[PDB]
C-alpha cells in the first residue's frame, strides 16, 4: 500500500511540475505564429487556436537598466549561498547513498561468504534455465547415465537451492516436481526390502 | 524589510469607481492616487499648473479621437522627462497606458524629434492594475526541477538491487 | 540532383499499390537507420514468436549506452536476422551508425519538424538532415536547390538550432 | 525574434519529452530500470540545454515588451490572460528557501576569500594526486 501511495505521490508531483512548464510553451509559441502563420499554427493547442487568431507576440525594444554595485554583488553572494546549500545537500545525499550501499553491499558479502564456505567440490556442475522461473541456477548431474545405465526415465539431475531460512544448501531433483514442501526427504525416501 | 515586487502589485479602489466610475476620461485620474504614479513626474507639475491657472496602429486613432489627449501633448512637449501617456483603450473594461520617458535633444546635428524611451508596462484590467517573462520561465523551470528531484529521489528510494538479478522494485 | 532532376523513377508524386498519389518520401541517415533497426527487431520478434508457436531481452537492443555497444547489438541483430550473406547491408548500417547525427527518436522528430515546418522540398529537407552546415551560405552553395528559395536568416537559424540539437556523445 | 524562436522550439521539444516520460510512467506496470534511466538522462540533459540556451539569450528576452493584441478580446478571455500573467512562485519552494536561508544563517568578504583559497588549494591538490599515479 505504501508503494501505491508513493507512486500516486510521484505521479501527482510530476503532473504539478509539468502543468507550470506547459504555460511557458503556450506563451513562447506566439512569436513565430505572428511572424509566420503556417509554421505557427501547429505549435499552439487547439483550444488556444479557438481562443484567438494568433499574432500575439511582436518584437519590441526596452533599454537595459543602468548597473551599479547594488544588485550584482548581492546576486552573486546569494548565488554563492544557494550553491553552498546545494553542496550541503550534495554531501548529505551522497552520505545517505553510501550508507545504504555499504549496508546492502556488506549484506551480500555475508551471503557471498556463506555460499563460498558452504560449497564443497569432479562433480558435473553447470548452469540451467528453470522451466518455471527461467533464470540460471546451478545443477549437478548425479545419475548413472554416463556410467553405463540404460535407464532412460530419469536423467539424475539435481538443482542446487540455497535455503533462505536455514542458510543451507538443498538438492531438488528434476522428476519429483510435484512435492513442494519440507517433507520431501521422508516422502521420497524409498527402499528395497527382501522377506523370506 | 520584505517588499512585494511592484510588477505583481495590484491596487483596487472601490470608492473611486463607485464615485466616478471607469472611463477613459478619468483613467489618469484613477491612476493618480496609485503608488505607481511618481510624484516627480511632469504630469503632476502640469496638474498643479492647471490648478493654479484655474484658481488665478491604434496610436494615431487614439491621437485623433480625443481633444484632452491633444492638450496632453501641448502641455507635455514643453516639459521633458518622465511622463505618463495612454497606450490603447478598448471599452468598456480595458485600458493600458504607455510608460515612456522623453529627452528633447534639441542639439545641433539631430534632425529627429524628442527621444521617447520605454520604462515600464502597466495594464488596467477592470478596476485592477498589473505591472519579466524571463523570471516567469525560470521560476516555472526551477519549480519543475524541484518536483522532478523529489520524484527521482523517491523512485531511487523505491529501487532495490541484488547481484544475481540486477535492479528491481 | 542539383536542378532537382529526379526523373520518372523518383517523381515527387508516387503512385502506390492503392492507386492514390502520395508525396515522395526521403529519409536521412538517422530516419533510415531507425526505420531499418525497427524493421529488423520486429522481424526478430516475429521469428521468435513463430519458433515459440512451433515448439524482456529486446528492450536492451534499442536503448544503447554507447556507439560501440550499439555496433555490437547491430552485429548480433545481423547475425540473428540476416544470416551474414549480405555484406552491403552491413556496410550501409555501419556507415549509418558511425555518422548518425542524431541517435534519439525524439530529437530526430525535432529535426524533422524544424526542417519541414517551412515546407521545403523533401530532397532539401533530407539533405539538411544529413549535412551539418555552420553558415547558411555554406549550405546554399552545397545545396544549389536551397538557393533563391530560403532566406539567409531562416537558414542560419535552422542550422544553428540543428547544431544545438546535436546530442553530445 | 530568432532567439525567442529557438527558445520556443527547444522548450517545445522539452515539453514533448515530458509528455513522453509521463505517458510511459502512467502505465500500471513499470518498465525495465534501464529504459527509465535512459529517459531520465535524456530529458534531464535536455533541461540542461534549455537552461543554457535561456542563459545565452537573456538580452533578447529582456528587450521584448509584452502587449496584448488589439484583436484579442480581454472581456471574454480575462481569465486566460490572468492565467499567463501571474508569475509568483509556488509557496512550498518559497518557504523551502526560507528555511534554507534560516539554517544557513568585511568578515563575510574575508570568509569568501578564504573559500577562494580553499577551492584553489583543493583543485591544485587533486591535480597533484592525479599526476602522482600514471592512469594511462
Amino acid at each position: 500500500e505504501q508503494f501505491v501511495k508513493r507512486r500516486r505521490d510521484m505521479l501527482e508531483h510530476i503532473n504539478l511540475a509539468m502543468n507550470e512548464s506547459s504555460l511557458a510553451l503556450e506563451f513562447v509559441s506566439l512569436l513565430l505564429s505572428s511572424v509566420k502563420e503556417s509554421t505557427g499554427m501547429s505549435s499552439m493547442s487547439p483550444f488556444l487556436r479557438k481562443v484567438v487568431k494568433p499574432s500575439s507576440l511582436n518584437s519590441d525594444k526596452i533599454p537595459y537598466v543602468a548597473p551599479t554595485k547594488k544588485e550584482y554583488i548581492e546576486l552573486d553572494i546569494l548565488n554563492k549561498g544557494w550553491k553552498l546549500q546545494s553542496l550541503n545537500e550534495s554531501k548529505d545525499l551522497l552520505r545517505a547513498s553510501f550508507n545504504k550501499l555499504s549496508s546492502i553491499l556488506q549484506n551480500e558479502h555475508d551471503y557471498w561468504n556463506k555460499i563460498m564456505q558452504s560449497i564443497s567440490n569432479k562433480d558435473v556442475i553447470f548452469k540451467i534455465r528453470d522451466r518455471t522461473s527461467g533464470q540460471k541456477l546451478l545443477a549437478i548431474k548425479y545419475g548413472y547415465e554416463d556410467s553405463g545405465s540404460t535407464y532412460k526415465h530419469d536423467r539424475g539431475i539435481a538443482n542446487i537451492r540455497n535455503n533462505i531460512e536455514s542458510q543451507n544448501l538443498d538438492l531438488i531433483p528434476h522428476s519429483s516436481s510435484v512435492f513442494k514442501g519440507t517433507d520431501f526427504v521422508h516422502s521420497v525416501k524409498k527402499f528395497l526390502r527382501v522377506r523370506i | 524589510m520584505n517588499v512585494t515586487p511592484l510588477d505583481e502589485l495590484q491596487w483596487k479602489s472601490p470608492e473611486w469607481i463607485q464615485v466616478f466610475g471607469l472611463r477613459t476620461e478619468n483613467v489618469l485620474d484613477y491612476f493618480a492616487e496609485s503608488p505607481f504614479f511618481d510624484k516627480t513626474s511632469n504630469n503632476q507639475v502640469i496638474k498643479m499648473q492647471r490648478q493654479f491657472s484655474q484658481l488665478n496602429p491604434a496610436r494615431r486613432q487614439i491621437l485623433f479621437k480625443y481633444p484632452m489627449y491633444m492638450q496632453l501633448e501641448e502641455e507635455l512637449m514643453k516639459l521633458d522627462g518622465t511622463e505618463y501617456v495612454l497606450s490603447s483603450v478598448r471599452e468598456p473594461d480595458f485600458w493600458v497606458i504607455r510608460k515612456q520617458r522623453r529627452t528633447n535633444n534639441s542639439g545641433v546635428g539631430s534632425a529627429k524629434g524628442p527621444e521617447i524611451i520605454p520604462l515600464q508596462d502597466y495594464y488596467i484590467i477592470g478596476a485592477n492594475i498589473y505591472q519579466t517573462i524571463f523570471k516567469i520561465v525560470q521560476s516555472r523551470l526551477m519549480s519543475t526541477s524541484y518536483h522532478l528531484n523529489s520524484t527521482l529521489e523517491s523512485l531511487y528510494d523505491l529501487i532495490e538491487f541484488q547481484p544475481s538479478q540486477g535492479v528491481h522494485y | 540532383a542539383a536542378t532537382l532532376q529526379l526523373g520518372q523513377e523518383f517523381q515527387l508524386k508516387q503512385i502506390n499499390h492503392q492507386g492514390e498519389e502520395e508525396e515522395l518520401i526521403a529519409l536521412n541517415l538517422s530516419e533510415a537507420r531507425l526505420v531499418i533497426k525497427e524493421a529488423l527487431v520486429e522481424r526478430r520478434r516475429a521469428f521468435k514468436r513463430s519458433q515459440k508457436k512451433h515448439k524482456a531481452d529486446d528492450d536492451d537492443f534499442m536503448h544503447s549506452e554507447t556507439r560501440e555497444k550499439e555496433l555490437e547489438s547491430i552485429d548480433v541483430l545481423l547475425e540473428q536476422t540476416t544470416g551474414g550473406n549480405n555484406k552491403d547491408l552491413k556496410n550501409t548500417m555501419q556507415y549509418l551508425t558511425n555518422f548518425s547525427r542524431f541517435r534519439d527518436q525524439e530529437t530526430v522528430g525535432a529535426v524533422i519538424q524544424l526542417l519541414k515546418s517551412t515546407g521545403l522540398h523533401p530532397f532539401e529537407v533530407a539533405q539538411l538532415g544529413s549535412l551539418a552546415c555552420d553558415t547558411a551560405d555554406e549550405a546554399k552553395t552545397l545545396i544549389p536547390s536551397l538557393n533563391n528559395k530560403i532566406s539567409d536568416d531562416e537558414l542560419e537559424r535552422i542550422l544553428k538550432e540543428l547544431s544545438n540539437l546535436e546530442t553530445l556523445y | 525574434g530568432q532567439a525567442l524562436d529557438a527558445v520556443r522550439m527547444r522548450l517545445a521539444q522539452l515539453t514533448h519529452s515530458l509528455r513522453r516520460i509521463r505517458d510511459e510512467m502512467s502505465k500500471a506496470e513499470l518498465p525495465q530500470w534501464y529504459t527509465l534511466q535512459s529517459q531520465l538522462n535524456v530529458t534531464l540533459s535536455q533541461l540542461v540545454s534549455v537552461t543554457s540556451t535561456l542563459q545565452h539569450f537573456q538580452e533578447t528576452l529582456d528587450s521584448t515588451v509584452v502587449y496584448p493584441l488589439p484583436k484579442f478580446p480581454t472581456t471574454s478571455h480575462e481569465s486566460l490572460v490572468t492565467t499567463l500573467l501571474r508569475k509568483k512562485n509556488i509557496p512550498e519552494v518559497d518557504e523551502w528557501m526560507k528555511y534554507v536561508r534560516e539554517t544557513s544563517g568585511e568578515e563575510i568578504e574575508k570568509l569568501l576569500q578564504q573559500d577562494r583559497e580553499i577551492t584553489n588549494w583543493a583543485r591544485t591538490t587533486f591535480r597533484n594526486e592525479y599526476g602522482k599515479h600514471d592512469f594511462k
Binding site: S22, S43, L48 | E8, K12 | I112, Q113 | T83, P91
Partner: peptide, 25 residues
C-alpha cells in the same frame, strides 16, 4: 513534417499565488 503536436496541458484549476495587499485607501 510534424511527427505529433503537443497535447493541451492547460491547468485552469491552478489557484495562482497573486499577492493582494494595496486595497485600503
Amino acid at each position: 513534417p510534424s511527427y505529433s503536436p503537443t497535447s493541451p496541458s492547460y491547468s485552469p484549476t491552478s489557484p495562482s499565488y497573486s499577492p493582494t495587499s494595496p486595497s485600503y485607501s
